[PDB]
Design a protein around this ligand. Sequence first.
Ligand SMILES: N[C@@](CCCC[B-](O)(O)O)(C(=O)O)C1CCN(Cc2ccc(Cl)cc2)CC1
Ligand SMILES: N[C@@](CCCC[B-](O)(O)O)(C(=O)O)C1CCN(Cc2ccc(Cl)cc2)CC1
Ligand SMILES: N[C@@](CCCC[B-](O)(O)O)(C(=O)O)C1CCN(Cc2ccc(Cl)cc2)CC1
Ligand SMILES: [Mn+2]
Ligand SMILES: [Mn+2]
Ligand SMILES: [Mn+2]
Ligand SMILES: [Mn+2]
Ligand SMILES: [Mn+2]
Ligand SMILES: [Mn+2]
Lengths: 306, 306, 306
Amino acid sequence: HSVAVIGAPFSQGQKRKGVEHGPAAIREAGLMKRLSSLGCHLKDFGDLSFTPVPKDDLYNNLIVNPRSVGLANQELAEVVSRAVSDGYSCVTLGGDHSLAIGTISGHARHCPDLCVVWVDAHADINTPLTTSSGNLHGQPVSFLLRELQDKVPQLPGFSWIKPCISSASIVYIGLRDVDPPEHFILKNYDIQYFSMRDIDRLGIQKVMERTFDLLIGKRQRPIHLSFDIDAFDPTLAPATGTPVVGGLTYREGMYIAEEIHNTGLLSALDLVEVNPQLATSEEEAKTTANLAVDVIASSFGQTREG
Amino acid sequence: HSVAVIGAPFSQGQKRKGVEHGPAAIREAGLMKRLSSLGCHLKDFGDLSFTPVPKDDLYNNLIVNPRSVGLANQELAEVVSRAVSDGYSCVTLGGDHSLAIGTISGHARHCPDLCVVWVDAHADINTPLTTSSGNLHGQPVSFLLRELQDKVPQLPGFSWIKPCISSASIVYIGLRDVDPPEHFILKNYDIQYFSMRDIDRLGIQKVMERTFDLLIGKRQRPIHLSFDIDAFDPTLAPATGTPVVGGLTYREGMYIAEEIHNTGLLSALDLVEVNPQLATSEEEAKTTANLAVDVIASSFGQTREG
Amino acid sequence: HSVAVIGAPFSQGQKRKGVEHGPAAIREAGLMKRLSSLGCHLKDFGDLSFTPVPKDDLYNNLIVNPRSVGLANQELAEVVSRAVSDGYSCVTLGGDHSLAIGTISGHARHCPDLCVVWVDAHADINTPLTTSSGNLHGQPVSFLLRELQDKVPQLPGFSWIKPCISSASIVYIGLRDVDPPEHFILKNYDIQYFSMRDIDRLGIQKVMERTFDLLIGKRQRPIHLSFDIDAFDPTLAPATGTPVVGGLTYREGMYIAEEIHNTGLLSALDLVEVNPQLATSEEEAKTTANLAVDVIASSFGQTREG
Ligand SMILES: N[C@@](CCCC[B-](O)(O)O)(C(=O)O)C1CCN(Cc2ccc(Cl)cc2)CC1
Ligand SMILES: N[C@@](CCCC[B-](O)(O)O)(C(=O)O)C1CCN(Cc2ccc(Cl)cc2)CC1
Ligand SMILES: N[C@@](CCCC[B-](O)(O)O)(C(=O)O)C1CCN(Cc2ccc(Cl)cc2)CC1
Ligand SMILES: [Mn+2]
Ligand SMILES: [Mn+2]
Ligand SMILES: [Mn+2]
Ligand SMILES: [Mn+2]
Ligand SMILES: [Mn+2]
Ligand SMILES: [Mn+2]
């Protein structure tokens, strides 16, 4: 079992400085040793340097850094595509969540039947026509879903993207801050999700059962886990750009990762939105990065029973 | 759609200074905008000024401020009754919990078949003969329950109260600090409650299901939600006079409020016992008031899924 | 009902200074009054003074303080035996968890069909041949289980010990930090446990039901509750030597204790590993000691409903 680790220091998917230091903070929290201890054979690609784009003006007076986010994701997809083809399970460290455009596109290139577990306080499914922020980290799913493309206009730097996934192939877990147009999109296309409310009702065990039943109940498929650290309650993960009260507990996050591992199907994992500069202290920064390592390690087989 | 907001800066139901600043703190946390955004048509009655009573001596060498609490509740009942009769759902901001004597009486003046969901760490059902503190905020239910009246002596200032609400018409949620005579009363009159222990066992979904079955399982009834902020764990709501460890989680509180909304029957809501002066910091004060706004907003339709 | 309180300041079962002050901190947090209030007739044995052993060198260049731990446990066992035979339910305040060798041996001396509920983040079942720390507080179960005895070598000071528990007679609750050799031992001897993961899945109510089914499902047996404070999440019990994130909530801890009380079979209780010196503040120390008093009180009948 080989694991590739890729640092993707994206910040241009949003407006708050510092999320580009996420990958280093996660490494400093001891990621590599933890993965080695589980018996992972590791390839560290280091932190990628993405090619900047000159004069990357607003798109339609609203969407920020479209060409930069586009090109960085194109380059990221290439590295992800290569690593999977060489047989690595791919861990990408963020960086803001717009990089899921790149990792999922790269992952899907040769594994078009992949499925997605998107763990997040947010749906990240605004389109360029519904976003109220202009921040691409709140739009990545819209570029990836096949059924939505008639409603997603073409952004500069995005033409290389071929929507690779059906709306029945993504399940959300932990949603509690959803824009009305996203709610419309989720219902209109029958996209399955388990909000914090669904977790309160069902418990995390049944949520995972039903998640896997929806996605792999009929056939084995490579799993893409896109994990936004803000899925966790801000008391546990404060160092992040859009914290929302009432998130996953520590145990719930571990349980999710444990079940991901137990399928035997994890093929790629994003760990995004850790922003050490948004912590009010270095303990808060470190606790967030430490939590990130716990998720990744649990996702690759670390247990709570030895 | 119409919602009335009434500030009741009640402190004489207890002895700790500052709870009378509860309504202002909740307003400053943005209550009105939150209600407006949900589509509530709003009438703000402002903060009431209650008529003082001269020489309001202890009753029986124990019960404090009886006439002041009695008259203030009489005046509050008049305002609530008027607002409910004009078609408003009535939100009352406290202030200590003795004001539920006024809001429930006033509410019942219009809607006599109302039922009550009492969310609280405490039962608040001591009588003047059982109270060990003399504080009327730990007695209000005793003046309201029809089955108890012959064990409830007549206090000065209380003669206007005609308690018409049956013991089968109130359900408690969150109880963990119950005085022995209150335990006796709950058992002797077969009053239903879900303690923190019951929540631990059943989970909050089943608790709400069973609550509504008991209250509205046979017929539709207007619901009075009397929500003591101290139902929440002290970590989440520190700014309150009688905090008790082991309370509701944030998610549990939201879920209760959501189920209240989903009945379509909410006719009045109390949000009581926020005391900004008991916070160790402005942050603890603001988090408590923000939490109060979350409960109220969720009770009137705010969701965690957009 | 009669309860004996025994202070056991031991701290030679591990390497961190200050756990020997655990009993005084628990007493100072109001233990005796809380117990009196429940109707417990109390005998206070005070804090025992254990006979020191000179030149108590490492065993096999690894195991620390063996004769000291051996002798202190012999002396503790005598006191527990005497108290149980004289009709007391026995509360032993620690002190590190190696003293369970003594309390369980003393208890089993005249109640040989006793069963054990071990509430702990850890399995405490390393042997002198598997421990990586040499600390006896992480080995006590190995000296107590009949089935393990041919693989547990003879330590100086330990010859008085006669293993008094079959592997089907102990159930663990709360495990999240288990050494691989301990995991091997647990599976190899089919010792039943409920990890934090099991609690996440089943809920604490089902965990307790199944716990009692296994232990007392066919016959009534005296119950020995060995409660390591570190079973609780570190946010609730920070003053302890080996904290592990993702522990029991406050409510879960109370629920365990309530269910122990509800069997009517509790015969002895250990409350171990409170180390007030490990708190970063006096507040952190007191909250840990207060939590310890809450467990003990709930185990002898304190309720959350009056
Ligand atoms: N839905 C979001 C949040 C996206 C977060 C992206 B992620 O990747 O961390 O899930 C988007 O930008 O599209 C926002 C949309 C609406 N805004 C509301 C808001 C914006 C600014 C302020 Cl000051 C207060 C409130 C915040 C959430
Ligand atoms: N049951 C109470 C508390 C009710 C709180 C009212 B509410 O509205 O906040 O639910 C009452 O005054 O009737 C009290 C009755 C008993 N006392 C016990 C006590 C009093 C003082 C102290 Cl310092 C320590 C303990 C505290 C609770
Ligand atoms: N299993 C333990 C801990 C048992 C704790 C006993 B108790 O009573 O508090 O449950 C043992 O000493 O046997 C240890 C075994 C392994 N070590 C790992 C470790 C040791 C030292 C350091 Cl600095 C970092 C990690 C710590 C736990
Ligand atoms: Mn997010
Ligand atoms: Mn996201
Ligand atoms: Mn209360
Ligand atoms: Mn109250
Ligand atoms: Mn232990
Ligand atoms: Mn332990």
